[PDB]
Amino acid sequence: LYKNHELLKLERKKTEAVARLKSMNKSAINQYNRRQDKKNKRLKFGHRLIATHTNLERDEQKRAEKKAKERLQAL
Amino acid sequence: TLNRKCVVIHNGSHRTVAGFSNVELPQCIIPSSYIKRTEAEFIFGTYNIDAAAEKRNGDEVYTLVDSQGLPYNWDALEQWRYLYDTQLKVSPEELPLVITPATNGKPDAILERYYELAFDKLNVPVFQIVIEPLAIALSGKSSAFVIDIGASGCNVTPIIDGIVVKNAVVRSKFGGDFLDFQVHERLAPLIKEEQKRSTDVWYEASTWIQQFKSTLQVSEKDLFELERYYKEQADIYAKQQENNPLVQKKNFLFKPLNKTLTLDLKECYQFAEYLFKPQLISDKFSPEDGLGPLAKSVKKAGASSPEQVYSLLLTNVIITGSTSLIEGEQRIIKELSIRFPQYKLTTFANQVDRKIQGWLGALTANLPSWSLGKWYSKEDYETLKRD
Amino acid sequence: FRQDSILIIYPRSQTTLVQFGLNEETFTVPELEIPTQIYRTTRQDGSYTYHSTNKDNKAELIKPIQNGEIIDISAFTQFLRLIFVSILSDRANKNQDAFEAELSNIPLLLITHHSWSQSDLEIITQYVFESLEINNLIQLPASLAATYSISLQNCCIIDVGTHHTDIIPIVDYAQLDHLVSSIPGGQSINDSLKKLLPQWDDDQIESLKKSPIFEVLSKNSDLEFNTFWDEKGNEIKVGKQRFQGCNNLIKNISNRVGLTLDNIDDINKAKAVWENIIIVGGTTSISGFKEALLGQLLKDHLIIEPEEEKSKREEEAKSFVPTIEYVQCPTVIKLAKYPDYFPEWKKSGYSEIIFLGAQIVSKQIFTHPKDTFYITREKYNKGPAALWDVQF
Amino acid sequence: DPQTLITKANKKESWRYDWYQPSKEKYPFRYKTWLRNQEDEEDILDLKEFDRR
């Protein structure tokens, strides 16, 4: 009885050390994946604005073109 | 997660990194040194290089962290005021503090000086101290052989199941700062040049010398052998008919004299070879002071079976540190693989973050429970103060 | 969200640019420019009250933002409320059904400055949700507004103020805080000129700087003397001094840019940054200034064969010369290309282009469902800390 | 009334920045943070002057 209680208590200490080691890994793995996510959502927002810019540019070009076209053939 | 925000400070021997736990990068990376300009006065911060370029007498650079990676000038360290005032811009009294090397256990006197600084002087609410190799490893490994190549030298730290093996902790004396010295001594005659003169030494180390290092290579295999081989091969191409890779030239624009410096690839490989075979500078260094032999630390880990620890460590090798970014991990691996042929090595390294991986480690302050770290409170100090 | 409803505020040391509602056809340069100050009366018993005018000469004049830094966070928040309220009143008169339409859901985009505390940013967040009772907030860094006004992943912002210039590298759409810095701007030109023209006074010198005949060189340049007119209509003639006074500033900025970009660790990022230098701020509208600044960065930092060395090699080959390749990343330096398709902005120059950055971001963000980049009431209900879950 | 203008537009907790003492009962230390509160816890300028013209 005394031996098992000592051994069981030692094993409980081992589980606390193990869960703690494991918990810190889980926290660590989640944090790393969060860094990658933020980095991706950022790069993704940037790369979309480029596209937005391209459309703003196309729209302007159409607008200016319609303006010049009337302007050049009319007083 | 927890409703808190920590200040995370890392005082390396060369760089100091500071920022809040709530964002992915530090607010500032500043030198772990300062100018004392003379009524005395203390300059901190990377650009504040301005003062150095002024080349004013009485200006002198002093350091905060010894080669142990430990603070040794505590009046000067109380830098912290500068960080809190001008960079984080927050009273040190508000937020929990997290600060960071592996030791053999003896100097661990430090904790007291930290109490005095954190409590007596700054009035910090509470602080944690993380062990650099341990945090870096955690920031998904519980057991790892952590090989840190920084400015002070190489620091080799086995870590088994979250615990640090202190007697197997090993600190080489040759690293980044050593490389600065050699780059300088070797290039000296092409740039004219060939404590108290600390200011120029420092400014040069922080400007052209830093760029030069970033633009050195480490040869994959013992260089003397690479040479004999490349020669032996070159003879045959030549003899055979009737290109030795070491003859490639590399060009560096040296700004202070608007002058090109050209090295052949061998001379580029030569600088880091010293980290591995320091017996090649002086006759006073044994091959055992070299990074490869410094095997020693793993074997001392096996002395807590051994061919098990060996196997654990070698499947979780972590390579880290500013200097570990010099092109050519592969030599540390080749050097490890041949001292331990029976075992398969698997190494891990941030490929991006290594310059500040120590601080990144401390940051990963984002652990979900207060019970995950020892947090010293003003109490702890009171109780130590008793007899 | 309603586009009528988007509110952008860009506070700076001297003035604050403001806009309420986006045009939908093209972006207009902000028309509201309110001096950045508030009056602070002190009421016996300690407390403070804040007014738009010196009330019966009882109030003190507070200038909340100085050198871009917030020096008085309470007067600053009071100043925002003062702007915000004014906008509500204005719209509420003109239309009267406004509280069901234009004023029913007002998202706020506040352009921040690199120097603002986290503590300052949280307090501002609290103020916007609690005092102004607004429900949606983006705090957009000035640097990013800059890069979004053809969206550059890697670049450097040189923002020239009156008393200071900020230098801010951006890598992978992220402001590199540890590289950021300011040097202690436009007044330097004034000061340089005072030394060169002792018998002039401040208003005379300021008038020259703002005149058509002041430029940085690197046809007016043909004339020994030229003429310009006082603030008060007085004609003033001036010699070579009108091509001076910008140099000391240009050199200082350049030395800083060099030390900064040299501390970018990824040589491949670095190359990209050097190829997208962005220069903004009032000073920069001085004819020739940007190009002169570029010219200096080239003179000081470009990776290229030293001329004497090259001249030898060409003599030697008299007896074709291959280009010497250097290992230094920054072998090419360029100003980032402006977008030419914002007609109103082209017309008025791009010294204030940071604001166009914000017009673009706000339209993107607020006219699309995803709430990833701003704080919502839902989120506010983490509090100010909510702020750090939507940083870019 | 400006305050009522603020009240009628844009249509709910409040936070304070204060000392907090975590527990495991309570840890010995304090630190400031943003805590949520319990149940129980001037003028106008004329634009146009500032419009550019």
Swiss-Prot record, chain A:
Q: Report the domain of life of the source organism.
A: Eukaryota
Q: Where is the HSA domain?
A: 4-75
- Localization in the cell: Nucleus
Assembly information from the UniProt record: Component of the SWI/SNF global transcription activator complex. The 1.14 MDa SWI/SNF complex is composed of 11 different subunits: one copy each of SWI1, SNF2/SWI2, SNF5, SNF12/SWP73, ARP7/SWP61, ARP9/SWP59; two copies each of SWI3, SNF6, SNF11, SWP82; and three copies of TAF14/SWP29.
Described by its record, this protein's role is as follows: Involved in transcriptional activation. Catalytic component of the SWI/SNF complex, an ATP-dependent chromatin-remodeling complex, which is required for the positive and negative regulation of gene expression of a large number of genes. It changes chromatin structure by altering DNA-histone contacts within a nucleosome, leading eventually to a change in nucleosome position, thus facilitating or repressing binding of gene-specific transcription factors.
Q: What else is known?
A: Present with 217 molecules/cell in log phase SD medium.
What protein name is recorded for this chain? Transcription regulatory protein SNF2
Residues shown, of full length? 585 to 659 of 1703
Curated annotation (Swiss-Prot), chain B:
What cellular component terms from Gene Ontology apply here? Answer: chromatin; NuA4 histone acetyltransferase complex; nucleus; RSC-type complex; SWI/SNF complex
Recite the UniProt keywords alphabetically: Chromatin regulator, Nucleus, Transcription, Transcription regulation
List GO molecular-function terms, semicolon-separated.
chromatin binding; structural molecule activity
The disulfides recorded in the entry are none
Q: Which InterPro entries match?
A: Actin (IPR004000), ATPase_NBD (IPR043129)
Q: Which SMART domains match?
A: ACTIN
Give the location in the cell: Nucleus
What top-level branch of life does the organism fall under? Eukaryota
The processes (GO biological process) annotated in the record are:
chromatin organization; chromatin remodeling; nucleosome disassembly; positive regulation of transcription by RNA polymerase II; regulation of DNA-templated transcription; regulation of transcription by RNA polymerase II; transcription elongation by RNA polymerase II
The extra comment attached to this record reads: Present with 1360 molecules/cell in log phase SD medium.
Q: How does it assemble?
A: Forms a heterodimer with ARP9. Interacts with NPL6. Component of the two forms of the RSC complex composed of at least either RSC1 or RSC2, and ARP7, ARP9, LDB7, NPL6, RSC3, RSC30, RSC4, RSC58, RSC6, RSC8, RSC9, SFH1, STH1, HTL1 and probably RTT102. The complexes interact with histone and histone variant components of centromeric chromatin. Component of the SWI/SNF global transcription activator complex.
Q: What is this protein called?
A: Actin-related protein 7
Natural source organism: Saccharomyces cerevisiae (strain ATCC 204508 / S288c) (Baker's yeast)
Which gene is transcribed and translated to give this protein? ARP7
Swiss-Prot record, chain C:
Q: Where in the cell is it found?
A: Nucleus
Reported effect, G282L: Impaired heterodimerization with ARP7
Q: Which GO terms describe its biological process?
A: chromatin organization; chromatin remodeling; nucleosome disassembly; positive regulation of transcription by RNA polymerase II; regulation of DNA-templated transcription; regulation of transcription by RNA polymerase II; transcription elongation by RNA polymerase II
Domain of life of the native organism: Eukaryota
Q: What is the effect of changing G281V?
A: Impaired heterodimerization with ARP7
Q: Which GO terms describe its cellular component?
A: chromatin; nucleus; RSC-type complex; SWI/SNF complex
GO molecular function, a single term: structural molecule activity
Task: Print the keywords alphabetically.
Answer: Chromatin regulator, Nucleus, Transcription, Transcription regulation
What SUPFAM superfamilies does the annotation carry?
Actin-like ATPase domain
Matching entries from InterPro entries are given as: Actin, ATPase_NBD
Q: What is its main location?
A: nucleus
Q: Miscellaneous notes for this chain?
A: Present with 1790 molecules/cell in log phase SD medium.
Q: What is the role of the protein in this entry?
A: Component of the chromatin structure remodeling complex (RSC), which is involved in transcription regulation and nucleosome positioning. RSC is responsible for the transfer of a histone octamer from a nucleosome core particle to naked DNA. The reaction requires ATP and involves an activated RSC-nucleosome intermediate. Remodeling reaction also involves DNA translocation, DNA twist and conformational change.
Q: Which family does it belong to?
A: Belongs to the actin family.
Name assigned to this protein: Actin-like protein ARP9
Source species of the chain: Saccharomyces cerevisiae (strain ATCC 204508 / S288c) (Baker's yeast)
UniProtKB/Swiss-Prot annotation, chain D:
Q: Where in the cell is it found?
A: Nucleus
Q: Which residues form a coiled coil?
A: none
What superkingdom heads the lineage?
Eukaryota
Known function? Probable component of the chromatin structure-remodeling complex (RSC) which is involved in transcription regulation and nucleosome positioning. RSC is responsible for the transfer of a histone octamer from a nucleosome core particle to naked DNA. The reaction requires ATP and involves an activated RSC-nucleosome intermediate. Remodeling reaction also involves DNA translocation, DNA twist and conformational change.
Quaternary structure, per UniProt, is: Interacts with STH1 and SWI3. Component of the two forms of the RSC complex composed of at least either RSC1 or RSC2, and ARP7, ARP9, LDB7, NPL6, RSC3, RSC30, RSC4, RSC58, RSC6, RSC8, RSC9, SFH1, STH1, HTL1 and probably RTT102. The complexes interact with histone and histone variant components of centromeric chromatin. Probable additional component of the SWI/SNF global transcription activator complex.
> What more does the record tell us?
Present with 1550 molecules/cell in log phase SD medium.
Name this protein carries in UniProt: Regulator of Ty1 transposition protein 102
